[PDB]
Amino acid sequence: QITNKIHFRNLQGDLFGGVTAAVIALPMALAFGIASGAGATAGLWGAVIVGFFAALFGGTPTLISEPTGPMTVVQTAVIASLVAADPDNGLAMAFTVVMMAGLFQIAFGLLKLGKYVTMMPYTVISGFMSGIGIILVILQLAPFLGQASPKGGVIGTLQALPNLVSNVRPVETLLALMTVGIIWFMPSKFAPPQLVALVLGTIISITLFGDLDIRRIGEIQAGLPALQLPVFQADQLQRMLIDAAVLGMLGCIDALLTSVVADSLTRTEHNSNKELVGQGIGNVMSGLFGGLGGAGATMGTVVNIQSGGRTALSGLIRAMVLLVVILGAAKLAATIPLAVLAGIAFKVGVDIIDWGFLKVSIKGALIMYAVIVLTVLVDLIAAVG
Ligand SMILES: CCCCCCCC/C=C/CCCCCCCC(=O)OC[C@H](O)CO
Ligand code: NA
């Protein structure tokens, strides 16, 4: 009808699905937020808002949308660059970009476009993806070392590598490695590794408690409030639209590619242009409330489905579990150390870089490598300096 496929069977499936997808979203929404440079709060609220509305208004019932880790990476550059231009409205501006990219998605969908962003070749997707993975890893380079990220970032960071060398925090590195370890080697499929890693890492600051280490600090309790546009007449503004153009585009490609995975596991098919409209709305709303930009998650989505999610009620439920978790359990986050999140973010990076493809045309091999290099260069560029 006017919304995504919602019906009142799969109450059990949709409930187990939403709640599994909420606990998965939680460690990486914290991670992506911090990494973003916007609050940890910006990460969560995107996860709720993009999640909810895209679930309410899209065309893929099983689909779990959220700040996705090529959304985070792109968005993180944008924010950096817009703060460097205007430290008083940079963030705000960036949220306005999230909104604008929302709008773009709405249009690409409203305009018989969703169809042919499927025409992307694997080699390109794979280059982009391994490209984004590398960046994410290097961002965590600095959190791993136990000092905060420099302003490059990653040019700032690589610039700052030298005596970032010996200002080290050994316990933090130890903490970060420990986290990676927890995720990497637990055979012994619920108790998802990331939530396990997250929880143990915190509490293992009953071993390393006497030491000082960085944690997510306290943070805005409870409800979020409307930040309408600063579009700002900027010398920025021309830069904002190119930014909204990429972000919107990227968010469709990521939302869609997954929606194909959603198709696979379910024997169902889905509606692209409606999905893009769902993504648009979810993003517009997220920006309107300081959330990050999102798209369809594919870690979030498969786990929802295996739990047995079958209806957009999965999504709705997910976003509301999250919602109460944020507004009631805000105090817990504050003790979660940054190293643990770095570790988590690190492996997400590691996990999205494509390496089988490493170790079949001589063309593709090359295209990929270039797309990789191209994708780190533009990233490095987009951050002012
Ligand atoms: C020539 C012009 C330069 C081109 C440069 C830009 C390339 C285009 C961006 C592609 C977006 C691909 C997004 C793919 C995200 C889907 C990821 C996915 O479906 O699976 C994730 C999994 O975790 C991973 O192993
Ligand atoms: Na995805």
Swiss-Prot record:
Q: Which residues cross the membrane?
A: 11-36, 40-57, 70-85, 90-111, 122-144, 170-184, 193-207, 237-265, 272-288, 299-308, 312-334, 338-353, 362-382
UniProt keyword Cell inner membrane present? yes
- Intracellular or extracellular location(s): Cell inner membrane
Please give one Gene Ontology molecular function term for this protein.
metal ion binding
Q: Which residues bind Na(+)?
A: D254, T258, G296, T298
- Name where it mostly resides: membrane
Record-listed hydrogencarbonate binding positions: T68, A297
Q: Topological domain, Cytoplasmic: which ranges?
A: 1-10, 58-69, 112-121, 185-192, 266-271, 309-311, 354-361
Which segments sit on the Periplasmic face? 37-39, 86-89, 145-169, 208-236, 289-298, 335-337, 383-384
The UniProt entry's GO biological process terms, in alphabetical order, are: sodium ion transport; transmembrane transport
Membrane topology term reads: Multi-pass membrane protein
Keywords, in A-Z order: Cell inner membrane, Cell membrane, Ion transport, Membrane, Metal-binding, Sodium, Sodium transport, Transmembrane, Transmembrane helix, Transport
Q: What are its GO cellular component terms?
A: plasma membrane
Protein task: Low affinity, high-flux Na(+)-dependent bicarbonate transporter. Involved in carbone dioxide-concentrating mechanisms (CCMs) that accumulate CO(2) and improve photosynthetic carbon fixation.
Give the family this protein belongs to, as stated in its UniProt record: Belongs to the SLC26A/SulP transporter (TC 2.A.53) family.
Please describe the quaternary structure of this protein. Forms homodimers through the STAS cytoplasmic domain.
Q: What protein name does the entry list?
A: Bicarbonate transporter BicA
The organism encoding this protein is: Synechocystis sp. (strain ATCC 27184 / PCC 6803 / Kazusa)
High-level lineage: Bacteria, Bacillati, Cyanobacteriota, Cyanophyceae, Synechococcales
Q: Name the gene behind this protein.
A: bicA
Q: What portion of the full-length protein is represented by this chain?
A: 2 to 393 of 564
